Amino acid sequence: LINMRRYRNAARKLIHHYSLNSTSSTEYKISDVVMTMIFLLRSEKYHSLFKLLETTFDDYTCRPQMTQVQTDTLLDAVRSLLEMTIDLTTVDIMRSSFARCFNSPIMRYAKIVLLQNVADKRTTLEELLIERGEKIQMLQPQQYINIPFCDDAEFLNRLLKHIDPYPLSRMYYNAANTMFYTTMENYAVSNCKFNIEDYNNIFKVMENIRKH
Amino acid sequence: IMRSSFARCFNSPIMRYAKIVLLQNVALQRDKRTTLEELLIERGEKIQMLQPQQYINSGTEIPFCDDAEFLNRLLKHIDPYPLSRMYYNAANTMFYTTMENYAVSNCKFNIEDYNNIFKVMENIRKH
Amino acid sequence: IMRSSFARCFNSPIMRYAKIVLLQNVADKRTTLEELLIERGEKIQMLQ
Amino acid sequence: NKVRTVTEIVNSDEKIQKTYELAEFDLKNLSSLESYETLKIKLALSKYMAMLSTLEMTQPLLEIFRNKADTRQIAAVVFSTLAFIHNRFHPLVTNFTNKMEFVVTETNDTSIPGEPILFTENEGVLLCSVDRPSIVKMLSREFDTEALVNNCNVRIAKTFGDFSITEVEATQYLTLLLTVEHAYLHYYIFKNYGVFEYCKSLTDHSLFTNKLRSTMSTKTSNLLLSKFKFTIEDFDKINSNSVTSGFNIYNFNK
Amino acid sequence: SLESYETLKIKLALSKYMAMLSTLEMTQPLLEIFRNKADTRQIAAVVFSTLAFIHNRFHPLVTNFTNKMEFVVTETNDTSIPGEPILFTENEGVLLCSVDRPSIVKMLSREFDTEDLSDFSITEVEATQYLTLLLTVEHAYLHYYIFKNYGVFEYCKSLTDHSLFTNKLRSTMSTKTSNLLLSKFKFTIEDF
Amino acid sequence: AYLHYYIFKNYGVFEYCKSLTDHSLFTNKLRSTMSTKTSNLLLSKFKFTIEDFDKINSNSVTSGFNIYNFNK
Amino acid sequence: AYLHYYIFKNYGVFEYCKSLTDHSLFTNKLRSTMSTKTSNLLLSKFKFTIEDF
Amino acid sequence: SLESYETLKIKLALSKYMAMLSTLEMTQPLLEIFRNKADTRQIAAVVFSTLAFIHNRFHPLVTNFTNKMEFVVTETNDTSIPGEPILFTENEGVLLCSVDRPSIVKML
């Protein structure tokens, strides 16, 4: 007999991280993987997800064939587990993450990786720039534009009072990690090499900008 | 023993995606002013965590130079240089750096202590 | 206290010199001195 | 207030005197206070929220970006954010570029991986691209709102002695503001140095330091992303795949 | 001609410090070393030998000095002591040195008021920087000597209360302390 | 308790709550006035030490550099 | 090359990089206090100007 | 006679540079070294010691110099800086030198 609630909570947290649906950085151990897999097996309506993630043990065995109703049901199951949008690419992210976690060896220090192996056309940033630029130029513009900056002291005072208890550092961390994860997921989904040199050089540019 | 091995294994961290880590840009001090003593205690605690480096001199003898020609030559080169202006510049840059550090550190500057620093003048003159 | 002390004595290996320890593993909320200071200070201010 | 210093040497009665103006030291001390910089950033964010409010944009940003049908609100929000950032850079122009067009993207097939807001010239007018699903995914992601990022003594001493804006909403506002700030830096290089330099910058952000510090570093305020030093966890290990036996003689970006 | 004799005193002392720094086998001028955070060995050597030179001046019978020194080169503000760029002490008989590099860089990089064939020449800025570093290490040595002569507690109390420079400096060793260039000038602060 | 209370009354609530978490401030806030005016303290009659203090403290060891060792 | 190197040491790799493209730092960042020092260079013994014709 | 004194200044400086190059133990004249792409050590030594000589002239109190130098001898155009045949900098405290050999050969 196992505790359904604890296993469900561990599964929820680990899947939240492994789906890139949350920026909560909590050190995850092998125990959380064991709990999430056991809960996935035990719960009847998560059997599809459990089989999906268990197929990742061998790299040569790929995703089971699911008819549209099965994919929709699994999407509803994932949504219920996360109580949050969620779609097929989230499932692909989860599959890749769990595959890399499972095939990884037992080790003393957490391994830091980047999203990869999701979604034939292995491209770079510039070819995508050209192609999507042409495609965007194809698209018809929707709105044509042809400005109040009020400094109402009382209103800004009330806004500051509302914002004052918020730990600015936490807000910056959340925003930066959200932008980073969205950029990485867009790169991986588009099958484009994510050049972290450029992304880190963005921060380096900000740092060099400040001190002048 | 197998249970202990499994306990060590289950606490092993798993792979995680990278995250953007925030580092403090400038050691910004808090609103409440601090005195020199509390600042000294805090900064000494911070220094304790640093890793000291070993310096090994070639020999124990005090460095020195008895080359006359070089000594009178340096003296001649610095001869047209007034001592008043040199000492004034040195003292004022020392004072400015001290005051800047005090202001940045949000620490109260005791004028009397800084004045007492340079009372060895009268101590020498009187005795 | 007795249970913790005897547990640590039993699980300790046979050794030639007496092992000096401090009390631990008695009584969820792992706290420090300052959080306790704040909490018990509020609770004491509650008391008439 | 001014402070006077006197130096006296033992060879004469001469005294050389200098006057220091305390306002400089007070300014440094104020700039060294954490609460001061926190107030500056929070006041910028509050001004942004007030600017949105006076434009009826009171609905949460996530709800604004989740509405596929109503494009006018998305275009107005992005334009207002761009104008706010432009005014922050140049506190003399209240109206942004007087004419520009907006196109909203709902497909991955025509999406740019990492630059959700992009700018282009259709030979007649500025055009701005908005990747709506990317911004929706950004704002809808769950935030870490219980963890603490690193004074207990003042709290101990104290113990011994109306628009509903949640933390999630404020984080969403800051996220959109930073995204539009990045877009505006790209747009500034565009407008001031040509399409060629803009598309060069899109693939190499390192040109920002040279094309901003020449004018912006001495004339405008501080940038929002410069409030904290951001680094990627275990950056060296992940970058080990691309390592050069280098010889950097033009290391213009430390 | 007594004032000329005293100026000769001070300038000869400064020239001897200059020549010691020359003999110490320097690759760059002082300021240049202090902006080079990559090479802490040279900064430590300069500070240590200035301390040794001051020690010999204060104690003319002492001809050698310890050959080891634990040192930390301060880089960040949260580990820097305002008003004390260099601090000397020892623990278990091992000399302990702390150098605030950014502070000394700011000290030597200020703009100072400026009211034969071999091409040798010394600028005013260089000489004044030399005197400034000598004075700073000399203040550090005063704190160090208070430590040795009256305990780590008198050292710590003097770090916060500098009147021990005039109380604990007895008149018997007035001739000894007069050897310091810090005693050749007075600097006072008056509100205005 | 009276040493804590003396720091309280003479240096404020902030210093009192600072002392509650760090007793090492006693040496600085007592020796300035008490060490030369009052009698000897009762706990100073004997030198008290914890048995095998170094071994138990080995959990918290610093590669230290103490320049303000105001408490030997 | 040594002038560029000395600009590097005295004012940062950024001043070095900016001087690599803008050589007016040879006359701005070369303060008159070290004029005697820079006069020791043989590069200071001559002037070379370029005039359109 | 001030112009004669200044010419004596300049020519004595040039002669001292000449004598330093002589003491540096050269097998060939400068141009000859610079056309010898097979021996980069000699070119690096010449450039490094000229840098050291200039450093001593600019800083008369400096008598020694670093004993290590990372150097690259440029051969192709796509790795050459126009107008800057030799460039000095350092990274992690290690002197970094770049020499454009064809440019200097054309100069001499």
Side-chain angles (χ1 to χ4, degrees), chain C residues 25-39:
Chain C
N25 155 18
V26 301
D28 304 345
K29 39 201 162 303
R30 183 50 174 165
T31 180
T32 89
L33 178 58
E34 313 133 319
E35 307 108 5
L36 260 206
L37 225 59
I38 286 164
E39 165 184 321

Side-chain angles (χ1 to χ4, degrees), chain A residues 16-130:
Chain A
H16 253 273
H17 174 53
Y18 272 7
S19 74
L20 291 175
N21 278 338
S22 175
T23 64
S24 170
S25 83
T26 296
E27 215 193 292
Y28 301 110
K29 312 174 320 295
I30 294 176
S31 66
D32 326 299
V33 172
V34 152
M35 300 165 88
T36 194
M37 273 318 111
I38 288 173
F39 169 70
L40 272 193
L41 170 36
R42 266 270 210 94
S43 182
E44 215 140 53
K45 98 209 186 318
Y46 293 115
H47 280 181
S48 297
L49 191 50
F50 166 76
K51 187 41 81 142
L52 169 66
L53 295 180
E54 163 293 343
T55 49
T56 67
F57 285 177
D58 314 45
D59 47 340
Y60 56 67
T61 298
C62 71
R63 184 181 300 71
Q65 285 314 93
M66 323 203 297
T67 85
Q68 178 75 351
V69 59
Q70 280 160 289
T71 89
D72 286 8
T73 302
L74 168 161
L75 285 172
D76 311 307
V78 157
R79 227 151 294 184
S80 296
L81 180 51
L82 299 181
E83 332 92 319
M84 181 275 258
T85 190
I86 330 305
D87 82 9
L88 265 282
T89 195
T90 307
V91 176
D92 193 5
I93 300 314
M94 281 188 2
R95 183 151 181 300
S96 180
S97 188
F98 270 108
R100 283 171 90 218
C101 162
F102 286 138
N103 272 36
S104 172
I106 302 163
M107 81 216 320
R108 303 263 64 89
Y109 36 104
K111 154 153 81 183
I112 309 304
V113 316
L114 301 179
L115 183 61
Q116 51 194 91
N117 155 18
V118 301
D120 304 345
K121 39 201 162 303
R122 183 50 174 165
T123 180
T124 89
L125 178 58
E126 313 133 319
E127 307 108 5
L128 260 206
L129 225 59
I130 286 164

Side-chain angles (χ1 to χ4, degrees), chain B residues 111-126:
Chain B
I111 270 165
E112 295 87 337
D113 192 63
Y114 208 96
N115 289 335
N116 294 339
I117 288 170
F118 295 117
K119 281 205 277 149
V120 314
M121 181 65 157
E122 314 309 23
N123 304 153
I124 276 303
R125 204 202 51 70
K126 294 167 182 174

Side-chain angles (χ1 to χ4, degrees), chain D residues 183-207:
Chain D
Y184 178 87
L185 298 187
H186 282 298
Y187 163 100
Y188 177 87
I189 270 167
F190 171 88
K191 184 182 40 56
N192 284 17
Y193 297 85
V195 184
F196 175 66
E197 280 259 301
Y198 163 98
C199 328
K200 214 153 58 40
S201 75
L202 283 181
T203 69
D204 191 352
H205 287 94
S206 67
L207 321 154

Side-chain angles (χ1 to χ4, degrees), chain D residues 210-222:
Chain D
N210 263 337
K211 320 312 292 304
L212 282 208
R213 293 180 297 103
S214 69
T215 65
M216 176 300 316
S217 72
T218 60
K219 141 192 77 192
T220 89
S221 76
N222 289 26

Side-chain angles (χ1 to χ4, degrees), chain D:
Chain D
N1 286 319
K2 273 148 288 305
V3 166
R4 291 207 294 99
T5 64
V6 179
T7 67
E8 155 146 358
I9 320 303
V10 47
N11 57 353
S12 72
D13 57 324
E14 195 161 288
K15 316 158 151 188
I16 291 55
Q17 161 185 189
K18 185 134 85 88
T19 301
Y20 290 81
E21 170 27 80
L22 284 199
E24 173 172 351
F25 297 104
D26 301 301
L27 263 278
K28 311 201 177 140
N29 163 250
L30 213 53
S31 322
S32 308
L33 289 174
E34 182 268 357
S35 72
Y36 181 66
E37 318 297 333
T38 302
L39 196 166
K40 224 192 291 183
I41 299 301
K42 282 194 198 262
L43 155 63
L45 194 59
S46 99
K47 279 178 163 131
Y48 174 70
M49 281 176 298
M51 157 280 254
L52 282 178
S53 79
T54 172
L55 302 179
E56 192 289 341
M57 290 343 296
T58 296
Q59 217 158 356
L61 286 195
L62 181 54
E63 291 183 11
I64 310 184
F65 283 106
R66 279 213 204 121
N67 164 324
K68 247 189 49 50
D70 166 28
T71 297
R72 183 71 164 174
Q73 270 192 30
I74 293 168
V77 162
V78 176
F79 187 80
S80 38
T81 319
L82 274 169
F84 174 76
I85 286 156
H86 193 21
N87 195 10
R88 285 191 74 249
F89 280 88
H90 312 86
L92 300 170
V93 188
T94 59
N95 280 303
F96 196 59
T97 299
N98 57 12
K99 141 170 294 186
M100 77 161 29
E101 336 287 9
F102 274 61
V103 51
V104 304
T105 316
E106 291 56 14
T107 62
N108 174 17
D109 167 45
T110 89
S111 169
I112 295 295
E115 293 279 345
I117 296 172
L118 273 198
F119 302 90
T120 183
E121 201 42 45
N122 62 11
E123 302 176 351
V125 56
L126 229 42
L127 173 65
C128 173
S129 171
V130 180
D131 192 333
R132 192 194 67 75
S134 293
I135 292 164
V136 165
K137 264 183 221 58
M138 261 196 297
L139 303 180
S140 67
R141 178 169 283 119
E142 144 152 37
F143 293 145
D144 189 343
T145 322
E146 107 295 358
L148 298 177
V149 178
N150 300 313
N151 192 313
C152 290
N153 255 297
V154 304
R155 291 170 182 169
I156 282 177
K158 174 147 50 192
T159 297
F160 277 106
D162 55 355
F163 291 167
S164 100
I165 301 308
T166 65
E167 213 180 296
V168 174
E169 290 156 304
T171 49
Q172 288 175 331
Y173 283 116
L174 178 61
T175 296
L176 186 64
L177 199 54
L178 288 174
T179 299
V180 182
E181 189 204 10
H182 186 82
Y184 178 87
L185 298 187
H186 282 298
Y187 163 100
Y188 177 87
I189 270 167
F190 171 88
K191 184 182 40 56
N192 284 17
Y193 297 85
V195 184
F196 175 66
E197 280 259 301
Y198 163 98
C199 328
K200 214 153 58 40
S201 75
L202 283 181
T203 69
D204 191 352
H205 287 94
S206 67
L207 321 154
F208 276 134
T209 178
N210 263 337
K211 320 312 292 304
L212 282 208
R213 293 180 297 103
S214 69
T215 65
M216 176 300 316
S217 72
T218 60
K219 141 192 77 192
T220 89
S221 76
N222 289 26
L223 265 65
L224 300 165
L225 208 63
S226 74
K227 186 44 210 43
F228 292 93
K229 194 202 171 33
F230 303 95
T231 180
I232 306 164
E233 179 156 280
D234 265 347
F235 170 70
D236 277 350
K237 304 269 301 313
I238 306 168
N239 214 17
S240 68
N241 72 317
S242 180
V243 172
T244 306
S245 176
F247 206 80
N248 219 13
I249 88 163
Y250 192 68
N251 194 327
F252 65 108
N253 213 307
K254 311 188 204 183

Side-chain angles (χ1 to χ4, degrees), chain B residues 37-126:
Chain B
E37 184 183 350
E38 327 163 338
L39 199 59
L40 269 164
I41 288 164
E42 178 44 47
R43 303 288 174 82
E45 186 305 339
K46 274 313 170 43
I47 289 183
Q48 256 147 40
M49 312 261 286
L50 273 158
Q51 174 63 258
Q53 292 179 315
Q54 284 46 16
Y55 174 83
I56 301 171
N57 193 352
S58 67
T60 58
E61 194 210 39
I62 296 282
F64 78 100
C65 170
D66 52 357
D67 226 322
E69 304 152 300
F70 203 76
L71 288 169
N72 324 59
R73 185 191 281 291
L74 299 177
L75 179 64
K76 151 210 153 211
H77 274 292
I78 73 192
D79 152 33
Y81 284 20
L83 274 177
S84 297
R85 204 181 31 220
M86 265 144 60
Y87 264 102
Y88 150 89
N89 278 321
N92 269 270
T93 184
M94 284 184 327
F95 157 75
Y96 184 85
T97 301
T98 294
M99 271 272 298
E100 203 201 28
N101 277 337
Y102 263 120
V104 168
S105 297
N106 204 31
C107 198
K108 181 58 185 174
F109 179 97
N110 186 317
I111 270 165
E112 295 87 337
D113 192 63
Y114 208 96
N115 289 335
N116 294 339
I117 288 170
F118 295 117
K119 281 205 277 149
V120 314
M121 181 65 157
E122 314 309 23
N123 304 153
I124 276 303
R125 204 202 51 70
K126 294 167 182 174

